[PDB]
């Protein structure tokens, strides 16, 4: 019948990955598509060369309505590719399966891909510690049941709800750390219950892409020859990475601020308490999402180079544009990236889920950490 691809993502480690699979697929220029991707614009020069092509917007972290006027499009028998964020899967599957209830006879769920939303979900899985976690596998199990049967979403645990959907749907995913599943003892179960259905998200994927795929995929990334210039300087580099507050809270916002700019100058100044030398090139890598706490930094700061907030760091890790440190605030992006190039990661006390996760992992050592309220106003 019909196969039908979507990407559904809100954030952005997702949809990075999401774009690599375009990207693999991008020699079919007719399979059906719908790009839910918050973070992404597709290239309308892209776009062009592409048919049976669709984009949603995601609102409350699932597509609106408007998805359903694109499936009507395909009147015929469709089976429905899914590619999700794994925080947000229950979320974003919610309408397809109002629209699945509508069309049973026509409207099926061939796979679903899952990808890492980032930290969140080994922040939240360390939450888990001290819980049977086997039992909570098969009542998350029973609740999916009913969420599929009703439509009606009800978990007692939420978490472990996100990892259960291999007992309705073909699955696979993608971790940003197996590593966790393999060291945190309490996941035993959930490690073996997940079986052969999960890998690693894989960052070599760029480097066996062909040269026309590889700056096909940076269009999509929107990593500019600009931004690759800016990067080959034949100098040491520091890159400071930023953060984002999810609370439109304006005292909180301006305080996230204040706090970040007050740490860049912990590494950039001699009487920082992380100073990194004077012979490094400094660069301003941005959350995505840091709004005006970006527009902060670069208003504030000075030799400061930017790199538009909306590309993604993985990508340097792509082509090979890492520098010398990297230091800022605790970020997903610590998770992939190589040991020797960490400078210093910073937390927003012994019992913090997110120090946990990374103590776990080997990315922060048995460090006193740093929290940056514990900083000198500079
Ligand atoms: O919406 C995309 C981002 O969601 C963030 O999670 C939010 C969530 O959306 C919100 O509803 C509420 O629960 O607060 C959460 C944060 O505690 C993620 O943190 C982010 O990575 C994106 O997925
Ligand atoms: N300063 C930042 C912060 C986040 N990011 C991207 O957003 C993703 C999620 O990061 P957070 O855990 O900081 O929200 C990362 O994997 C990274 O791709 C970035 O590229 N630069």
Redesign the pocket.
């Known amino acids: 019948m019909k196969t039908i691809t979507l990407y559904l993502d809100p954030?952005?480690?997702p949809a990075?990955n999401q774009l690599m699979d375009f990207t693999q697929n991008n020699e079919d220029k007719t399979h059906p598509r719908i790009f839910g991707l918050s973070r992404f614009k597709i290239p309308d020069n892209i776009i062009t060369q592409y048919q049976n092509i669709h984009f949603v917007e995601l609102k409350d972290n699932r597509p609106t309505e408007a998805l359903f006027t694109i499936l009507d499009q395909y009147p015929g028998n469709i089976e429905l590719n899914i590619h999700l964020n794994i925080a947000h899967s229950v979320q974003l599957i919610r309408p397809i399966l109002a629209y699945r209830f509508k069309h049973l006879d026509r409207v099926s769920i061939q796979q679903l891909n899952l990808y890492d939303?980032?930290?969140?979900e080994y922040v939240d899985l360390e939450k888990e510690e001290n819980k049977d976690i086997s039992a909570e596998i098969k009542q998350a199990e029973k609740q999916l049941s009913h969420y599929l049967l009703t439509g009606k979403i009800k978990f007692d645990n939420p978490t472990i709800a996100r990892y259960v959907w291999q007992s309705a749907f073909p699955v696979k995913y993608h971790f940003?750390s197996t590593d966790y599943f393999e060291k945190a003892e309490f996941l035993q179960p959930l490690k073996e219950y997940l079986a052969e259905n999960y890998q690693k998200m894989d960052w070599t994927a760029y480097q066996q892409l062909t040269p026309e795929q590889q700056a096909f995929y940076l269009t999509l990334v929107g990593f500019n020859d600009e931004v690759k210039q800016s990067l080959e300087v034949q100098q040491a580099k520091f890159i400071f990475?930023?953060?984002?507050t999810w609370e439109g809270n304006t005292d909180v916002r301006e305080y996230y601020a204040q706090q970040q700019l007050n740490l860049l100058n912990h590494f950039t100044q001699a009487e920082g308490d992380l100073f990194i030398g004077d012979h490094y090139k400094i660069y301003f890598?941005?959350?995505?999402?840091?709004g005006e706490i970006n527009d902060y930094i670069l208003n504030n700061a000075k030799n400061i180079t930017n790199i538009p907030?909306n590309?993604?760091?993985?990508?340097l890790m792509m082509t090979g544009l890492l520098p010398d440190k990297v230091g800022?605030?605790?970020?997903?992006?610590y998770?992939?990236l190589p040991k020797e190039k960490i400078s210093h990661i910073i937390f927003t006390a012994l019992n913090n889920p997110y120090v946990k996760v990374m103590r776990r992992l080997g990315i922060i050592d048995e460090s006193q950490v740093i929290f940056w309220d514990s900083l000198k106003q500079l």
């Open positions: 954030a952005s480690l990075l939303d980032g930290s969140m940003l990475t930023g953060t984002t890598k941005g959350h995505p999402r840091g907030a590309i993604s760091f993985e990508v800022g605030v605790a970020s997903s992006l998770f992939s």
